[PDB]
């Protein structure tokens, strides 16, 4: 079974590299042609370049500007995609892909977020019911990098769960809200409380969301 | 470079229905032209190869046809695990490229919002910035207006939406505006309200509170 599996994702500061890793298996590694391919909002899916296994050779989209360097170890059938002096606009999922008429086969994909920001955790605060259906949740806000896990009731509540894409604010932080309908008639008797996760931080905190 | 330019950029189906996908090409590409299908979170996968090939296993409901700059991709029967979004590739010449997209999303009738206001928490104005969020619960179609209003007073440039992925249960879309301010702005004013305008509602409905209860 073909496979290509990528290395995990990468958190850069604008000037700096990122080295993506792709081990290919079930297959003749050296016989095919191994691409990298991007994608992120607002330039879409985007081809940088391949390398042939068999004798190294690899060609590289001129929009990089030398930028790329795709390089491959047949002692291993690891391909590897290096990216130099990085910018924002590089932050997208990285892919692998071999090729024949098209790519029938891709990796799993890698994120790469570059940014100026330093790490940090979330605050929480609650989004509290107020004003028979009732609506309440969180607010994750000024947190970086993605991504952070939200569960209610320590995953016990589901049902009427929306969490909501994170934005990018002007800051570098990300924030995002986590809602659930509930009926108004649970808010005295019913405990709901948020649980938020960011493993980078190490931030792992419980908000108990109550009526105002 | 040859630009891949896809039409639509989104259509709304039916499971069952025939769905039609063109991709113009800017110079000729002969048949050198892959589909792909993409579901969030996932990478593409192959559904056709040189232009009218279906791909090993890819089911016959997929066809594409064409040659040179105009090519089409069809669905005959939509099935429920075909809401997704498909693009087109050229690797006919260098630099290989891709169509921006077409998202295939599912219709259904027609659903008003149920609207929610929050005010900053006590929390949040400890620490210097206030966040008011706007919630817009299982609606459709997609097409909404959030606008907000602050003493009255039309907002522009302060807020950020977001929208989930269609529901899984009912395709429905929630939408979150957030309209965030300085504490000290934020203090400088009565009633924050924000009004919502879609198809589903005769006229627009607003949501408000006056700061501080
Ligand atoms: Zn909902
Ligand atoms: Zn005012």
């Known amino acids: 079974q073909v496979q290509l599996v990528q290395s995990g994702a990468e958190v850069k500061k604008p000037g700096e590299s990122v080295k993506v890793s792709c081990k290919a298996s079930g297959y003749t590694f050296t016989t095919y042609y191994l691409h990298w391919v991007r994608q992120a909002p607002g330039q879409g899916l985007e081809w940088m370049g391949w390398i042939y296994p068999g004798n190294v050779h690899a060609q590289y989209n001129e929009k990089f500007k030398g930028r790329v360097t795709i390089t491959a170890d047949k002692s291993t059938s690891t391909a590897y995609m290096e990216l130099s002096s990085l910018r924002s606009e590089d932050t997208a999922v990285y892919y692998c892909a071999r090729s024949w008429e098209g790519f029938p086969y891709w990796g799993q994909g890698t994120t790469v977020t570059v940014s100026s920001a330093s790490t940090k955790g979330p605050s929480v605060f609650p989004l509290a019911p107020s004003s028979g259906t009732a609506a309440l949740g969180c607010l994750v806000k000024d947190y970086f990098p993605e991504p952070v896990t939200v569960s209610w009731n320590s995953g016990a509540l589901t049902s009427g769960v929306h969490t909501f894409p994170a934005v990018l604010q002007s800051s570098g932080l990300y924030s995002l809200s986590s809602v659930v309908t509930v009926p108004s008639s649970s808010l005295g008797t019913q405990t709901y409380i948020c649980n938020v996760n960011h493993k980078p931080s190490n931030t792992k905190v419980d908000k108990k969301v109550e009526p105002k | 470079d040859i630009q891949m330019t896809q039409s639509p950029s989104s259509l709304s189906a039916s499971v069952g229905d025939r769905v039609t996908i063109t991709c113009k090409a800017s110079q000729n590409v002969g048949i050198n032209v892959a589909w792909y299908q993409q579901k969030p979170g996932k990478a593409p996968k192959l559904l056709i190869s040189?232009?009218?090939y279906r791909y090993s296993g890819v089911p016959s409901r997929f066809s594409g046809s064409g040659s040179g700059t105009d090519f089409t991709l069809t669905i005959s029967s939509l099935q429920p695990e075909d809401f997704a979004t498909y693009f087109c590739?050229?690797?006919?010449?260098?630099?290989?490229?891709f169509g921006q997209g077409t998202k295939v999303e599912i219709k259904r009738t027609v659903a008003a919002p149920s609207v929610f206001i929050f005010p900053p928490s006590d929390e949040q104005l400890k620490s210097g910035t206030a966040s008011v969020v706007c919630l817009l619960n299982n609606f459709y179609p997609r097409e909404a207006k959030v606008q907000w209003k602050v003493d009255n007073a039309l907002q522009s440039g302060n807020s950020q939406e977001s929208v989930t992925e269609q529901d899984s249960k009912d395709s429905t879309y929630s939408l979150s505006s957030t309209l965030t301010l300085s504490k000290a702005d934020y203090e400088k004013h009565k009633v924050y309200a924000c009004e919502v305008t879609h198809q589903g509602l005769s006229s627009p409905v607003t949501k408000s509170f006056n700061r501080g209860e």
């Open positions: 040189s232009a009218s």
């Open positions: 590739q050229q690797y006919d010449t260098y630099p290989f490229t």
